[PDB]
Symmetry: C3
Subunit: 154 residues, 3 copies
């Protein structure tokens, strides 16, 4: 009895592992994940950068990062409105880096940006990045609430 | 050693339940659940109140109930049409109560509502409530089909 | 303690099956699954027919098949653009059948279709079927990429 029951429960567990994997695949498909490509998701909520970062982390993802003009456009389509990107110069002013580390290999800065402007009156300069109309980028205060868009691996 | 095999399987179960929790969080996120806020969702199907209660119950949720103007708007945006709210005055005519218990603490009645006539016995008249396009409330028969919207805890 | 632990593990497993079923049910609901009706999902990706078949198959579903007017409208609703249907005449030119077997019954052909056209130049005639924006059908080359739409059981 005991060992037979144990061997079965082992099979039951493996079966559930398989079903959950299938469930995740179906969910990814329904969320718009294209075959073999990274995908973006949002709940359309606006919040400060630290909050977006913490939320995406909780979902085992990261703040959306465009690596080319295609993904940049993709992020816009998902967000609809301006959203934070996983890029900041919080560590060293003027040196933007991906929140996952490393220098930028692609950028789409609006003319005259980034400028670390203080005039937004929120205190401090601007160490965060968000997409604006036309898909261009602007550095803004990490305190401003922008649409949370998380990214998940291809 | 069966005790070791048992211990390993218990560990496997905990890993799976953690992954399922993650799957659930990501799904809610993808469907618009805001941080710290209740999650409202619909399949856009119209049915009698009794069917809505059973359906939401089967999903471990309840018929949507707006406790404030913000939530009222969130429900309105999810339904996009006329949908039932988890509120009824079946015990005492005119005294609306939440299906989950308690007296109303917020309402958004249309000027001439509720307009149910007095004197109806059990099941007679208008003892159910539905929200409309603009977010206003109307009382109506629980047998009339309206959009099913369920809510899940924050 | 061994037998007590095994009993608990059995309960842990069944509660996991229960919660997984709940996740699948809520997901279907959020995707618009109507009670007692099969539902449709798409990631909005366009690909050749063979890729759609394989993709839906991996998800435990199949290429969407409109069995009546209602399902046809539901499919164009989810697709929002031209998509393949699970109907072809690969087995016998001129006589269509469902990818899951059986002769085609309900159809919504555009005037002068199907015509097994060779003018497209991709080589061969047209053995696949796709629905257009207005919901009408046309037979086209299985080699052409169209939106991937899967259906899952009622
Ligand atoms: Ca079994
Ligand atoms: Ca800066
Ligand atoms: Ca700036
Ligand atoms: Ca009454
Ligand atoms: Ca009444
Ligand atoms: Ca009324
Ligand atoms: Ca336990
Ligand atoms: Ca043909
Ligand atoms: Ca044709
Ligand atoms: Cl800042
Ligand atoms: Cl063909």
């Amino acid at each position: 009895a005991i060992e037979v029951k144990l061997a079965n429960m082992e099979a039951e567990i493996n079966t559930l592992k398989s079903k959950l994997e299938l469930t995740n695949k179906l969910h990814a498909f329904s969320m718009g994940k294209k075959s073999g490509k990274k995908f973006f998701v949002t709940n359309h909520e606006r919040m400060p950068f630290s909050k977006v970062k913490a939320l995406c982390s909780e979902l085992r993802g990261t703040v959306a990062i465009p690596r080319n003009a295609e993904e940049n456009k993709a992020i816009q389509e998902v967000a609809k409105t301006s959203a934070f990107l996983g890029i900041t110069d919080e560590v060293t002013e003027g040196q933007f880096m991906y929140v996952t580390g490393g220098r930028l290999t692609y950028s789409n800065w609006k003319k005259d940006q980034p400028d670390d402007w203080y005039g937004h009156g929120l205190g401090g300069g601007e160490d965060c990045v968000h997409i604006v109309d036309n898909g261009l980028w602007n550095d803004d205060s990490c305190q401003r609430p922008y649409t949370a868009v998380c990214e998940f691996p291809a």
